[PDB]
Write a protein that binds this DNA or RNA. Structure first.
Ligand SMILES: O=C(O)CCC(=O)C(=O)O
Ligand SMILES: [Mn+2]
Length: 202
DNA sequence: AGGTAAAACGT
DNA sequence: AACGGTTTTACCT
């Protein structure tokens, strides 16, 4: 059984590419550091984030925004690593989205207990473009629902190297990550990373 | 009028 | 601890 209409999980798709992806996460973070963003309501997110590529997802007092500039450093986000772009392209093609051209990569870091409450990815103007989501390190429970918040949830363990792609009919589906369980991974030591690729511009 | 804020406590 | 209330409102454009 596939995940949803226009959605698929590619298990261990990024396993072989993982070590290089993690080196490149470190390189990106050396320029635009991980930070826990503050919601408009004034709460600090448990997930630490940074971005690469032309546009980066951020919180602001007025809401959420994709920006070409890191508001912390006041410099552009680091360029999207070739390893990121190549993996994303291969995953998108395998998932049935061969024309996907991302211009934005959000890098999430989960410490033990870190979560991402059920939400939609909707800050992007071109809804024809899919989401490519790459898991690295410690395993996490991914929630995948429907168009409405109360739509029944699928719960899927996402392990190191797993790639999830959604778009088309499932593009605006609610999804999230349950509080991360503590553990060890030889490549990340004590955390989970996630790479979320999007077309956020035109 | 529609979009977005909640990507964030009680049972 | 899975589910759902809150946005059951307050501001922008
Ligand atoms: O960490 C994940 O697997 C999901 C991340 C996510 O939903 C997001 O960054 O919008
Ligand atoms: Mn998301």
């Amino acid at each position: 059984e596939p995940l949803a209409a226009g959605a698929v999980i590619l298990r261990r798709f990024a396993f072989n590419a993982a070590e290089q992806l993690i080196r490149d996460i470190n390189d990106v973070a050396s320029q635009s550091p991980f930070r826990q963003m503050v919601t408009p309501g004034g709460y600090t997110m448990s997930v630490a984030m940074t971005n690469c590529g032309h546009l980066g997802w951020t919180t602001h007092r007025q809401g959420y925004l994709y920006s070409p500039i890191d508001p912390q450093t006041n410099k552009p986000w680091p360029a999207m690593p070739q390893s990121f772009h190549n993996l994303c392209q291969r995953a998108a093609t395998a998932a049935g989205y061969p024309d996907f051209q991302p211009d934005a990569c959000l890098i999430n870091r989960y410490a033990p207990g870190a979560k991402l409450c059920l939400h939609q990815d909707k800050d992007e103007p071109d809804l024809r473009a899919p989401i490519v989501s790459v898991s690295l390190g410690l395993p996490a429970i991914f929630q995948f629902g429907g168009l409405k918040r109360n739509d029944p949830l699928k719960r899927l363990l996402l392990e190191h190297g797993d790639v999830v792609v959604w778009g088309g009919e499932s593009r605006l589906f609610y999804h999230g990550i349950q509080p991360l369980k503590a553990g060890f991974h030889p490549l990340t030591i004590d955390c989970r990373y996630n790479l979320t690729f999007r077309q956020a511009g035109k």
